[PDB]
Amino acid sequence: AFRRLVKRHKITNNQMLLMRRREPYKPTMKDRQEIADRAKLEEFERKNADGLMFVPEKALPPWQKSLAHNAKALGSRINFRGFRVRVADGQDEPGFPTPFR
Amino acid sequence: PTDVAANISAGAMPPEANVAAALPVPRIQYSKWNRALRSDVYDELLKLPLRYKLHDFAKLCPPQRCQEEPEAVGVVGRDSAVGYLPPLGPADPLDTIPFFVHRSSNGVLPGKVFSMHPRNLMPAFYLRIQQVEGDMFRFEEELLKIFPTKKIFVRSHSIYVYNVALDGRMVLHHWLLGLGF
C-alpha cells in the first residue's frame, strides 16, 4: 500500500474486473527480490570463475592510477629494470595461484 | 572479437598478454583537432554496400614523404601532423551527389555529439549534423544504411542520430571524407 492511488487500466475483457494483480505471471515482491539476488550472485560467481586478473597502471581506477604513476615516475626517469615501488593502495592479494598472475 | 582474458585463463595465449586483456591497444584518438584516420573502420566502410563511391585511403591520408625541403610553401596538400587536407571531391566525375556537406570555420566536420538531458549528467548521447545542404533525405538514407539499428530523424536544419557516441561520429567523419566533403 505504498502507492495510495491505484492505476485504472483500460478494461478490454470482463475478467480484468475480477483480476486484482496487474501482472499475474510475475513473481511477488520478496520472491522476485531473492530471485534477483540469486541471479546477481550467480553472475558474480561466473565473473570470478577465473582468477583475479592483475591490471597495469593505466587500466586502474582514477583514485589509484595517478597515485601509482607518481609513486614510480621518479624511477621512470632512469631506464633500468628491477625497480619496484611497494605502494599501499592497489589490487589486494587473491591468496591462490592465478593463470593471469 | 577475442577475449584475451578468457584465452589466458584457458591457456590458449601466453600469460604476458594481461596488459592486452586489461587495457586496449594504444592508438592516436580521433579528435576535432587531430584527424587520426582508422584504416580498419575505413576498410569496413569500403566493404559495406553504398551507392556512392569513396576515395582510396591512400588519397585520404596526407602524404608522408622526405622532409629535406629547405623552405615550405602553400601546397593544397602538404605534410601535416594532425592530418588536415582540403576536400578531394567526388570519386567518379560522371556522377551527381544529391547533398553537399559544408565544413565549419576551423575546417572541422559537422558531426557533434550531444547528450539527452545533460543536467542530470546522463550517459545517453546523440549526434547532430547541422551543416548538410541539398537533399537532406538522401543523406538520411545513407545514414540509415550506415547505422541500421539506430533512430535517425531529419529536419530543415539538423539530422539527429540517437544512441551513437564519438565511436559513431568518427565513422560518420570517415564516410564524409571518403565521399569527398
Place this chain on the structure above:
Amino acid sequence: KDGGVLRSSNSAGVGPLDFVSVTLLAQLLEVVSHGCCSADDLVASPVAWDKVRQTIQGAIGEDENTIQLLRAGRLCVADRQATGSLVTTYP
C-alpha cells in the same frame, strides 16, 4: 638437514624415508651386522628392519636419531611391499 623431513609433528608415525637413501641405509646396516641381514632381505621385508634394530648391538641403537631412521625405513619398506602388488615391473 638439506632435504626430506623424517620427524612428524604428530610423532606417532614418522615420515616415509627416501627410497635411494633406504637402499643405502640397508647396505650400511648389512655392513654393520656383518652380513647377518642382507640388504636385499632388508629392502624386501619390513620385519627385517626390526631384526636389524635388535641385532644392532646397541653401539648405535641407543641413538634416538638412529631409532627414528630405522622406523622411517621400516615404514618406507612397508609402503613399498604394499604397493608392489599393484605396480607391475617390466625388465
Place this chain on the structure above:
Amino acid sequence: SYALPPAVGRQEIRGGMHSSHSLDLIMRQPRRVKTPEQLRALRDRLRFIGVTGPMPQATSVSTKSYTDTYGSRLRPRYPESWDTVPPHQPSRELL
C-alpha cells in the same frame, strides 16, 4: 503401419453418434498411400512455390512463373468481399 487404418490402435454413453463421427469415419476407412514407393512417387511430384531459392524449369521452356512475369512487389487484384479475403500489404508480408 501403412496399410492398416489409423484407428486400429485406439484404446477406447454408447450407441449414439458423437461430434467426431465425420472424423472417425475417415479414421476407420483404410489408408490411401499404402507404401513408401507411392509416398515418394507423390512427394517427388509435390512442389513448393514460396520456397526461397530457384526452382526447376527444365520441364517446359515456354512457361514463365508469375513471380518472374510480374515481379515480386506486384500481385493480381483480388475480389475483396465478406466471402473471401486476400492477403494485404505484401511488403509487410516479409519478416
Place this chain on the structure above:
Amino acid sequence: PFKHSWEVNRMLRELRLEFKGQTTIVPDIPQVRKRIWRVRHIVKVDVLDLDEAKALIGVPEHISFTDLASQLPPSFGRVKAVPSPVIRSKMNFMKLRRMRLRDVLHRDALELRLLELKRSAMKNXEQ
C-alpha cells in the same frame, strides 16, 4: 488463472493462456507434458494424433507438416516472445526500417544500373 498463485500463472503463460476460456494447441513434448501436469486442475486437455489432425484439417496424407511449417511465413503476428516490450517495439521498428531500406535499395540499384549504362554508352560513343 489470475485467482491462483504466480507460479501456476507463469506455467499457464508458458502454455499461452491468459484468461478463462482460452484454447491453445501445443506439441506432446516432455516440457509441455510437464507444464500440463503442473496446471492439470485449471485446464482440460484433448489429444489428437498426427493422422487425426490430418483428418481434422483438409490436408492429404502424402504431405507432412515439416513442409507446411517451412512454407508458412515467419512474419506472423507476434512471431517471437521477446524478453521485453522495448525489444518488441524495436523489433517492429527494425521491421519497418527493413521495409524502407528495401524500397531505397531498389531505387539505388536502379540508379546504379542506369549510371553504369550511361558510362558504357559514353565510352562506346567515344570509341
Place this chain on the structure above:
Amino acid sequence: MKVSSRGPIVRWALSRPTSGLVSSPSEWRCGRDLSDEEKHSGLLLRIRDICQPLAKNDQLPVAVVKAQPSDLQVNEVDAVGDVAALSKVVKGKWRKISRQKTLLIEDDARTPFSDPSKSFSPRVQSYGEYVRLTGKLPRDLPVLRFVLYRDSYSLNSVENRLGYVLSLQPDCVFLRDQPGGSFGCITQHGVCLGVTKEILSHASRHYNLHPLIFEPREYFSTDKLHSLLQGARGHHHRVLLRCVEGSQDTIRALLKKTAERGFINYFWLDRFSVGTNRFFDMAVLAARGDYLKSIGALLHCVAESNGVHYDHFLKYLNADPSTVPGIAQTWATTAKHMRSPNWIVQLLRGLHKYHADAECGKSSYLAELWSALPMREALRRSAAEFVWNAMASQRLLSKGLNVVEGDVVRMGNYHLVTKDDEEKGTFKITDVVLPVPYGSVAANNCLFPHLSPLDKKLYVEFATKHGMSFLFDEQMPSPLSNPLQFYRHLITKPVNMQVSVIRDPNSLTSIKSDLAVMQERKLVQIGDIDYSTRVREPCVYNVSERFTEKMEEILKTHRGPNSVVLSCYLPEDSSPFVMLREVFDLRHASFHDLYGLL
C-alpha cells in the same frame, strides 16, 4: 602484393572459451587425432604392420593423452648420469633502497586546525622501493649450471622470459630440447654465461598456476662448457593415459609386447609442427627464395597458434590494397601492446614498412626480413629430420626388421655390417643405425648404408623431389645449445617399464607433480612410480572443475573404462608418444604446444 600462404587457417581456440572446452572444432572437442598429420610428416608403418599385414586393418584401442599439465612428466638426465631433480626453491632476494613515506593526517574532526594541541596520525603512501639483489660474479667461474622445472612453457617462451627479466641475449643461455612437447612438467638442466645465482633466481615464477622454477646448482669454468653442452642420454617419462579400451590383462599384454619387441624411433610431430604449414615447408620455401610465401606460411602458423594474431591476419588477408599498410601498422602496434616476442614484432614492423614504402617493398627487403629471423636453422633441422624419418620408413618397408648386409651398426664408432657379422656377429635391429643428413659436413662424414636402391642416390632423389636439395648442397652448422648428432637407431627398448592400470569410468585419476611432492616435504625420486605417493586414487577432489568440464566431452565420446599410468626411461631423443602410437590410438586433448614459434 600480399604474402600468399597455402592451406586452411583453422583456429584451434574459441573467441571466448568460458568453460574447460577450449578447442573450437567439434572434431577436436572430443580429442584430436594426429594420424593424418604424422602420415604427412613421414611416419606411416608400424612394427605390427611389418610383422603381419593382417594386423594393419585391425584397430588399436583408443587412449587419451595430454589431458592436464600433470599427466606428462619428463626428467632429463645428463651425459654424466645425474638426473635433474628439484631440491630447494629460492626466493627473489630483493633489497630495500628507500625508506617508506608517511603523511600526517588529522586525528580528530571536532577540534579545528587552529588549535595548537591538534593531534595527527601518520599513514603510509608507499612502503618503500626495492631492487633485485645481484651477487658478485667470479671471473674464474663465469659459467653457471642450474636446473629448470617448467609447467607447460615452450623453450621459446622461457628464453623470452629470461630475456625480458634479465636483459639476457639469446646466445648467453643454453637450453636443450626435450621430447614430448612443452606441455606437462619438464625438468631439465641449463647453462648460462655471466649470470649469478641471486639474479637468476628472479626469472622463476612460483605464484602462477603453471610454475616455472630455476635453481642454480654450482659454478664452472669455460673449459667445462663443452662437457656441459653435450646431449642428454636419457629422459625418465611418466605418462597417464586417460581413456583406454580393453581389460587390465589386455593392456598389460600389449605393453609387454611392445616393450619387448621395441618401438620404431621417430622424430615426433613436436619437432616439425602441428597444423597445415610446417617447419620444413617454410624451409623449402626460403630455399626456393619465395620469401613472400615463406613469410605467408610463417604468419599462417602464428595465426593458427594465437587468436589475436589470427584476427589480425584475417584482416590483413581481407584488406583493401590502399588499406594494407594501415592494417599492418595496426597489427604491429597490437603485437607490441600484447608483448609479443621481439622477433615477431620486428617482422611485423618490417612487413608494414614493406607494404608502405614503395622503394622498400622489394624481394631483397623480404629476404633481409627473413634472414633477420632466428629460427631458420630450426626449420632446416626439421627438414633434415623429415628426410631422416622418410628414409627410415623406406628402409623398414623395403628390408623389414631382419638385418641385412650393407647397413650401419654402432660398435661400441660405427661399422658396416658384413656377411660374417650377419651370421656370427648377429648385430641386432636395436644396433642397426641410420644416418641423418645435416649439411654437406654430415653428407661427407657419415657412413650411408648402400642397401640399393636405398643409397645416397635415393637420399638425394627424395631431397630433390621434396625440394630439400639445400640439405646436401649447403653446410649446416650445429647450435651450441642442441648438439647435432648424426646417427640414430631404428628400434628402441626402454630399460625399465612400469605399468599400473586403474579402473576409472569417470577418469578422475591424477599424478602428483614434482613441485607438489616437494611441497609435501617429500624429496623427489626419479626412476619409478611411487604408487603410495605419486598416483592418487580416483576421487572427486583430484581434478579441477575446469578439467572435469573439459574431460566431460572426451569421456562421453570415448567411454574409457580404464586409465593407465606408465613409467619408463628412454634414450637421448626417444619420445613416449612414438612408443604409445604403435600400441594405442592416441588422442591428444591438448595440442597447442605442438604449434611452436611462440
Place this chain on the structure above:
Amino acid sequence: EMAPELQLEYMPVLFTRTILGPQGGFAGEERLVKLEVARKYMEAGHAVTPTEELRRGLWCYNPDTDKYDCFIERNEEFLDFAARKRQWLDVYWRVNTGYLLFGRQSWGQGFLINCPLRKRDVAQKLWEQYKVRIDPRLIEFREKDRRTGIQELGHNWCWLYLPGAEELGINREVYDNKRVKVRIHVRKMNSMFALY
C-alpha cells in the same frame, strides 16, 4: 559397477542381525553401506567384515536366546527368502512409522472436507511419499468411513491388510501380522498443492 569416487564413500558390509532402514538389510546380506552408518553398525555388533569364510557361512542373532548362536549357511534360496522377508518388514515399517500427508481444499473453516478421499488417493499418496506400490483393494476404511471415506479434517487412520504374514513367519516380532494402521493427516494447503 559404481564409480570409484562414489564407492570410496561406501564399504562392503555383511549384516549379522536384520536391520530395517534405507541403509539396512537382512541377516546374511552383503551391501555397500556408507562409512558412518557402517561404522555404527560394526561398533554396535550388527555387522561384520565380508571375508570369504563369512560369505560362506555366518553366525546371526537369535531373538529367543538373545545370543549369536544361530549359524547360517548363505545359500541362494536363503538369500531369496530373506530378501522377501526384508521387503515385507520394510513395507510394514514404512507404513507404521510416520504420518501420511494429505493437502486439499475446504471452503471456509469447516471440519469436513470439500471432496472426501478414497482408496485411490490413499494409495497414490502412499506411493508418492513412501515409495510403496500397493493396490487400493488392500485399504479398508473405518466403520464410520465405509460410507464416504476419509472426510474429516485433521487426523484420521485407516487399516491396511498385508496378506503375506504366516508364510514368512513374522507374527512374533510384529505387533499384528494381519493388518497395519496408517495414520493420515489431512490439511488445507495452497492452491497448487490442494488442486481440488
Place this chain on the structure above:
Amino acid sequence: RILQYFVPYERDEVNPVVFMDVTVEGDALGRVSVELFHDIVPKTTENFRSLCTGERGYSQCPLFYKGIPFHRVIPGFIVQGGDILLKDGRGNVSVFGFPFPDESFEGKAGKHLRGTVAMAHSAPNQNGSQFFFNLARNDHLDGKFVVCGQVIDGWEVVDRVAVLSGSSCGTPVSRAWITECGQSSGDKLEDTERALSGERALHTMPGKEVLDILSPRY
C-alpha cells in the same frame, strides 16, 4: 557412373578462398573449398566470407555457418544451404543488417556453370545468407541469381551430399549440416596434375615406395 569435374574458370589468385566441412548423419565426407569472385562481386563476396569466418558476433542470429544444415537439396539440380536465423529456409539475414540487392550481372557472375556457387534470394533485390551450389549447367538461372564463385576441390563431397540427402521435391531425406567453416589461403591446382607422372614413376620403380607415397606440398 562418375563424371570428372573441371574448374570453370582460370583460378585467379587475388580472390579469397573459403573452406567448409560437411557431414551426413555423423559421417564427415570431407572439405570443400570455393574461390569467391571478389573482382566482380565485391559486396556479396565480403558478405559470404564474413558469414563463413565468423568475424561478426551476432545481429539477429549467430553469423556463422557451423552447425547450419542444408534445408533444400535437389539431386542433380541444386544443393542449397544457409538460413542461419532459422535453420529452416524461411529467413534471410546478411552481415550488413539488411538484405542487400544485386550489383552486377556480369559475365563472370551471370553464368551458372556446374561447379559454380551462387547466392539464393527470396526477392530479386534481397540477397540474404542462403547460398546454393549448382549441379548442372543451369541456363534458365542466368540473369536472376548472383554468382559468388566456383568450387575448386572437394566436389565429390557435395556430389555425395546431393546423392545421399536429396529428393526431387527439395526436402532432404537425411540431415546434412556443416561441421567447420572458415577462410583459407589460395592453393594451386597444377600440383595435382603431377599425379599422373607420380603414378607412372610408381609403376616404373618397385624398390622405392615412400617416394611415391609421400607427396610434397610445394
Place this chain on the structure above:
Amino acid sequence: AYLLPLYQNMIKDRDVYKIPLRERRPRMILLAPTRELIAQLHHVCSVLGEATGLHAISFTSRKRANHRLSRLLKQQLVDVMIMDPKIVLRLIRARRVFLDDLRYVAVDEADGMLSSQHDHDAVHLLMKVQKRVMFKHLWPVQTQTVFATAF
C-alpha cells in the same frame, strides 16, 4: 561443539579422500579476538590434535614477530592455524600462506569479529575464501564456515 565435527571432517579428508597436506596451505583456520583466547583454543586443539595427529599452530604478538612467524611456517607443517584475522591477512598479502586446500573456517565470537570493533578483519578474510570457492582452475573445495556466537 564446532571442534568435534571439524576435526572429524579433517580425518575423513586425511584418511578417506587422502588429501595431501602441504607447507603453506592449512586446512582449518580459527579466529579469536584476544591473545588469551588463542591459548585457550590451542590447549583444546592440543588435546584433540594429539589423538587425531593434527598439528595446531598458535602465535601471539611477541618481540620480533616477523622472524618467528616465518620460522613456524618453514620448520613444521600445519593444518590448523589459530591466529587473528589481522595477522592472517598480513601473511596472505606477504605470500607466507595460501588459501589453497583450505576446507574449513571457524570464527569464534563472530558477533564481535565481524563487526566494526575489530575493523571487519574477519569479514575481509571471509570474502577472500569465498572467492577461493569461485575459483575453478583448482580442485573444488567447499569451504564451510562455522560461526560461534554468544549473542
